[PDB]
Amino acid sequence: MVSKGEELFTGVVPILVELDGDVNGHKFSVRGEGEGDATNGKLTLKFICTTGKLPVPWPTLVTTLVLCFSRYPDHMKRHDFFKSAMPEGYVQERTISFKDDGTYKTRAEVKFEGDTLVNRIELKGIDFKEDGNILGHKLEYNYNSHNVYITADKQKNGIKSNFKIRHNVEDGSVQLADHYQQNTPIGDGPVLLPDNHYLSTQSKLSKDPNEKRDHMVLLEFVTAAGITH
DSSP states (O other): OOSTGGGGGSSOEEEEEEEEEEETTEEEEEEEEEEEETTTTEEEEEEEETTSSOSSOGGGGTTTOOGGGSBOOGGGGGGOHHHHTTTTOEEEEEEEEETTSOEEEEEEEEEEETTEEEEEEEEEEESOOTTSTTTTTOBOSOOOOEEEEEEEEGGGTEEEEEEEEEEEBTTSOEEEEEEEEEEEESSSSOOOOOOSEEEEEEEEEEOOTTOOSSEEEEEEEEEEEOOOO
16 A cells, blocks of 8 residues: 555445536536445446436536546556545546537546545536537447546646547447546645556446436446556
């Protein structure tokens, strides 16, 4: 163990996710629950739209709706910023630019509340086309595997990332979502600033057959890679 934070992730940790959103003035909320295991990189979450019908496709929210559950190999433990900020946690901020469409701006706090790892998010969506892939619901209910490159941000005592998500469109086209991310500790205690590396992601989206509300079941694996030793 190379951070106090890392001790909080030796087993399965229950998770709560809460998101309050506004896309082109359409107000919606999501709550998710499940668990994460950073020892194997496995995350199991079920999300509900608490306000009724989700006004955007579920796949567009996957990245917004807990990289502290990434599996960092033993040789990479000193490059795990996300756990090092725990339990006080970190702020995760993004701009997500949907190519030829609107933008999500997100601010989340990821931190322990009691024994639960909580991801609490505000999302603002602007400049979406009513007949675009997003407000038009033209995106397939599926998800690609990605590499998410992590860099140190010495000045902010945190990390940055930029990456493109590819969303499959019902017409066989692809909707690009360009992510710009910043993470900063909530605490003023010491954190691990990493050497350059990447996270390998893979996401399976499914439905709960008993669930009549608008929802998404997520199975994710996230693994850190890219450090020689």
